[PDB]
């Protein structure tokens with residue numbers, strides 16, 4: 154029953170994180186469907202202030218049917234609350250819990266030959282803090298918030314003075330949610346690092362550790378430095394809001410830009426915390442289906458270390474228009490460009506792994522090959538954005554939105570899907586139907602590119618971020634992007650059907666290693682599923 | 688006045704340039720776009736070729752190499768070289784952008800929730816600019832028969848809804864304009880795509896930007912820092928006019 158939720162075993166905890174991250178992902182993806190319904194056409198047709206005067210279930214269902222513009226008073230606060238909830242859920246309650254809490258907890262001990270993590274009760278606590286934080290984030294949506302409505306419409310990074318002046322206590326709930334997510338991440342990281350350092354199998358030297366376990370190890374270190382700094386930033390928001398401090402209020406001598414330095418000191422590392430475990434999965438998947446050992450194992454490890462270190466000295470590329478000196482803009486621009494070098498080494502080494510292999514195009518490999526192409530698309534627009542003189546035009550436009558959905562939704566998320574199809578047989582004892590995996594891949598690949606590639610055009614044409622409505626000239630590519638989002642949502646509902654089918658009636662797995670001998674890490678020597686004592 | 692600084696239906700490129708700084712952005716971006724498109728096509732072709740050439744039915748026995756020293760040196764040095772080339776062209780543009788020249792015209796701009804305040808300190812002119820269709824003009828941030836008639840009466844069309852304001856920032860062509868930007872309540876951001884300028888309007892700070900418009904016309908921007916409920920509804924209209932038409936506008940404001 155609920156003895157799933159009480160387990161301390163790293164495999165059980167990993168599975169909780171994976172299912173929960175997927176459920177929260179469905180919530181946040183559903184928000185984006187509603188967002189793209191409103192952005193499909195200029196004029197506001199869905200987010201009408203008139204829906205507020207009904208109940209909370211009457212108003213909900215009215216909100217999903219378009220109104221005529223003359224019957225729809227634009228409610229910008231609902232727009233701002235949706236995109237804020239969308240971003241907060243994704244960045245704190247979906248992809249890192251899936252990759253780090255999910256695949257990290259399940260497979261890193263297996264990959265290093267550890268029977269369990271150093272602190273199993275602390276690992277179970279980490280999961281409950283994650284659920285608590287998620288619950289507070291969702292609760293904030295229904296709490297008294299800005300403009301005498303419900304929810305915080307302040308953006309996922311909570312900039313003051315907007316965040317500190319938002320009425321209600323919704324924003325305080327969102328700050329507590331983020332606090333709880335940071336605690337979950339730090340506990341997880343403490344467990345990862347201790348287990349990696351102390352509980353490796355004797356005879357597994359550190360230079361025989363699989364790349365995925367390396368990626369979880371580096372990620373855990375980034376968390377330990379970045380998340381306490383975030384806890385400081387948002388506690389200062391909480392005291393400016395509630396305890397009379399003036400850290401970010403100019404009337405009391407404070408400076409709103411100070412918050413941005415502290416937030417982004419966490420905020421850039423956050424995205425390398427997202428993507429590094431995806432890098433690790435891609436290395437395991439490509440080696441398996443190219444039937445060839447990973448090219449340049451030691452450069453792969455060093456590149457992840459370099460990326461993680463460089464990730465701490467680039468933060469002000471999020472602040473080129475916030476009043477930075479020309480000297481600061483020049484430094485942060487050049488520091489940011491360096492990250493392309495270790496990332497390129499990993500992209501080229503993945504291609505070199507395929508080169509001369511015997512390539513099998515099964516579903517996990519499709520996700521990994523899509524990752525290589527789409528993460529590169531997103532990575533190079535990041536390099537565009539590092540150029541402060543071009544970012545002057547692109548900052549706070551949909552060009553930025555296009556950039557970060559390519560690296561996250563077409564990149565890190567492709568890693569998540571690669572992992573699920575790679576490992577669902579190993580975790581469950583049941584195999585996914587191959588044709589459905591491939592159809593899921595192609596629907597997502599077509600839909601997600603239709604969603605986000607036209608957002609480059611919108612950004613180049615000057616469409617700002619965080620807008621409920623837009624000038625008529627932006628209609629064409631917003632319509633295309635919304636169609637892509639609807640196709641992608643169908644792909645995701647299909648995927649959930651594939652998972653339901655797989656876990657209830659999928660073909661029984663008979664082999665310890667149902668792939669091939671080039672899946673050469675320790676989980677493939679165990680049964681499918683592995684024994685209770687991992 | 689011709690409407691120049693605005694998005695166009697189905698557009699995929701930048702808004703037209705009307706300043707030397709905007710022109711440099713177009714050149715720098717186009718240069719980088721050719722590079723990253725080459726890199727991306729190259730990466731994509733390598734993957735597709737590898738999949739075709741080394742598909743399991745075509746190459747049944749995989750190789751086992753994991754190193755290639757000349758190739759790994761090459762694929763570390765060439766990226767560094769490419770980045771240095773980009774930075775070499777992009778740092779000059781950045782310096783030209785951020786070094787404030789001597790002003791011919793000075794405007795102080797204040798972002799409010801949700802509108803902009805303009806002050807010309809040399810001229811003792813001040814006014815506020817609201818979106819046509821905002822509550823200030825009797826609307827509620829949506830198109831309506833009244834709003835389209837207001838747009839028409841002000842010299843615009845329904846297509847400029849969410850861009851056109853009731854008053855415009857008027858400046859002379861081919862003169863250096865220095866804009867001082869601050870925020871009154873929360874952070875806003877003042878921008879004009881056609882001029883290649885954007886500067887956050889931060890409460891407690893006065894930041895500067897500059898532009899020199901190289902042709903007359905109408906140029907639009909939109910508030911570019913999420914500021915609350917009508918973030919989408921506090922745009923920017925700049926009218927670039929002849930030196931003589933600029934003076935005529937100044938004189939229309941002179942109280943006798």
Ligand code: HEA
Nearest residue numbers: 424428470493496497532533535536538539548557560766
């Ligand atoms: C997975 C998450 C993720 C990842 C990995 C990245 C990776 C990068 N990002 Fe991104 N980014 C975000 C998520 C991510 N980002 C988010 C969420 C925001 C917005 C935050 C907000 O405001 O809400 C953001 C915004 C953001 C900004 C601020 C823009 C603005 O708001 O105006 C900048 C500025 O430089 C930036 C740049 C980069 C760079 C240089 C990389 C590099 O790490 C990329 C390196 C990879 C490559 C370059 C491709 C592979 C390399 C090669 C093939 C070698 C050859 C290539 C060259 C020589 C160029 N991104």
Ligand code: HEA
Nearest residue numbers: 174175178185240243251308309562618619620638641645
């Ligand atoms: C991981 C991060 C992530 C992901 C996956 C996404 C996914 C999507 N997002 Fe994004 N988005 C953000 C992070 C992400 N987003 C952030 C940080 C912001 C900024 C918020 C702000 O401005 O403050 C943002 C803002 C943002 C905007 C701009 C809002 C604005 O400026 O007003 C838009 C516009 O359409 C958008 C749309 C979408 C759509 C249509 C999808 C998807 O529907 C595309 C299709 C994807 C899928 C169908 C599946 C995704 C899979 C998972 C999430 C994995 C689930 C887990 C398991 C399966 C274990 N989101």
Ligand SMILES: CCCCCCCCCCO[C@@H]1O[C@H](CO)[C@@H](O[C@H]2O[C@H](CO)[C@@H](O)[C@H](O)[C@H]2O)[C@H](O)[C@H]1O
Nearest residue numbers: 186190193194195196198219220221222639640642643
């Ligand atoms: C995949 C799962 C979920 C997918 C959900 C898809 C929802 C699609 C909504 C249908 O389109 C909306 O509703 C009306 C029928 O299309 C249109 O009315 C509109 O008609 C005109 C369209 O130009 C507008 O100007 C009017 O403002 C407006 O009321 C309008 O175009 C559009 O907003």
Ligand SMILES: CCCCCCCCCCO[C@@H]1O[C@H](CO)[C@@H](O[C@H]2O[C@H](CO)[C@@H](O)[C@H](O)[C@H]2O)[C@H](O)[C@H]1O
Nearest residue numbers: 164165168171172175176573577580581582652682685
């Ligand atoms: C969007 C969501 C993302 C998808 C996530 C991927 C799905 C994860 C795999 C399912 O989890 C496994 O299912 C098995 C069910 O067969 C369990 O085996 C177990 O079954 C018995 C109880 O059912 C136990 O006593 C045994 O220890 C063990 O063999 C096992 O514990 C459990 O972890």
Ligand SMILES: CCCCCCCCCCO[C@@H]1O[C@H](CO)[C@@H](O[C@H]2O[C@H](CO)[C@@H](O)[C@H](O)[C@H]2O)[C@H](O)[C@H]1O
Nearest residue numbers: 586587588589592593596642643644645646647648650
């Ligand atoms: C929420 C929106 C979701 C929209 C999703 C749209 C769903 C489209 C379903 C298409 O129908 C399927 O086509 C497959 C064609 O491959 C068939 O598999 C067949 O072909 C496979 C590939 O050869 C074989 O492995 C199988 O034996 C064989 O069932 C499969 O049975 C059949 O049902």
Ligand SMILES: CCCCCCCCCCO[C@@H]1O[C@H](CO)[C@@H](O[C@H]2O[C@H](CO)[C@@H](O)[C@H](O)[C@H]2O)[C@H](O)[C@H]1O
Nearest residue numbers: 585586587588589646647648649650651652654655660
């Ligand atoms: C919005 C909700 C979306 C729902 C998503 C549902 C996705 C999962 C569908 C899997 O479909 C099954 O795949 C099998 C292929 O793996 C088929 O077996 C077929 O093919 C096998 C393999 O050849 C044969 O042995 C079987 O007898 C034969 O029925 C089977 O018919 C088909 O139904």
Ligand SMILES: OC[C@H]1O[C@H](O[C@H]2[C@H](O)[C@@H](O)[C@@H](O)O[C@@H]2CO)[C@H](O)[C@@H](O)[C@@H]1O
Nearest residue numbers: 483775777778779780781782783784786
């Ligand atoms: O656009 C030309 C630009 O050149 C100079 O700026 C140099 C600077 O002097 C150097 O220190 C270098 O590191 O940065 C800039 C790169 O061009 C002028 O000083 C500057 O005013 C001028 O705009």
Ligand SMILES: CCCCCCCCCCCCC
Nearest residue numbers: 180183184187209212213216
């Ligand atoms: C059932 C969970 C998915 C939520 C769908 C998002 C639509 C939200 C509509 C907002 C209505 C405001 C009252």
Ligand SMILES: CCCCCCCCCCCCC
Nearest residue numbers: 186187190216217218219220
């Ligand atoms: C002409 C009357 C309106 C026809 C369009 C209705 C579309 C409603 C779509 C609702 C989808 C909710 C998920």
Ligand SMILES: CCCCCCCCCCCCC
Nearest residue numbers: 381382385386388389392415
């Ligand atoms: C009692 C005020 C809140 C204290 C939180 C920390 C403030 C110090 C700044 C630290 C910056 C992040 C480490």
Ligand SMILES: CCCCCCCCCCCCC
Nearest residue numbers: 382411413414415416418478
């Ligand atoms: C814990 C890291 C905090 C982020 C650094 C804050 C730097 C403040 C620099 C202010 C620069 C004024 C010129």
Ligand SMILES: CCCCCCCCCCCCC
Nearest residue numbers: 514519522523526591734738
């Ligand atoms: C970017 C990923 C593309 C990978 C190409 C896959 C080609 C699939 C050919 C069909 C193989 C049997 C269905």
Ligand SMILES: CCCCCCCCCCCCC
Nearest residue numbers: 587588589591592595596599
């Ligand atoms: C296991 C063999 C199945 C063959 C590939 C199925 C996927 C077909 C591509 C569909 C593309 C639609 C978007």
Ligand SMILES: CCCCCCCCCCCCC
Nearest residue numbers: 602603604605606607633699
């Ligand atoms: C490279 C991904 C492309 C995704 C499709 C977007 C459509 C682009 C069409 C551009 C030309 C239309 C006139």
Ligand SMILES: CCCCCCCCCCCCC
Nearest residue numbers: 193194636638639640641643
């Ligand atoms: C001009 C009216 C456009 C309305 C079209 C609605 C398209 C909805 C498509 C949903 C597709 C889901 C895959």
Ligand SMILES: CCCCCCCCCCCCC
Nearest residue numbers: 530533609699700723724727
């Ligand atoms: C490699 C991704 C680059 C995304 C930028 C798309 C820009 C399209 C250029 C069109 C410009 C028309 C002049």
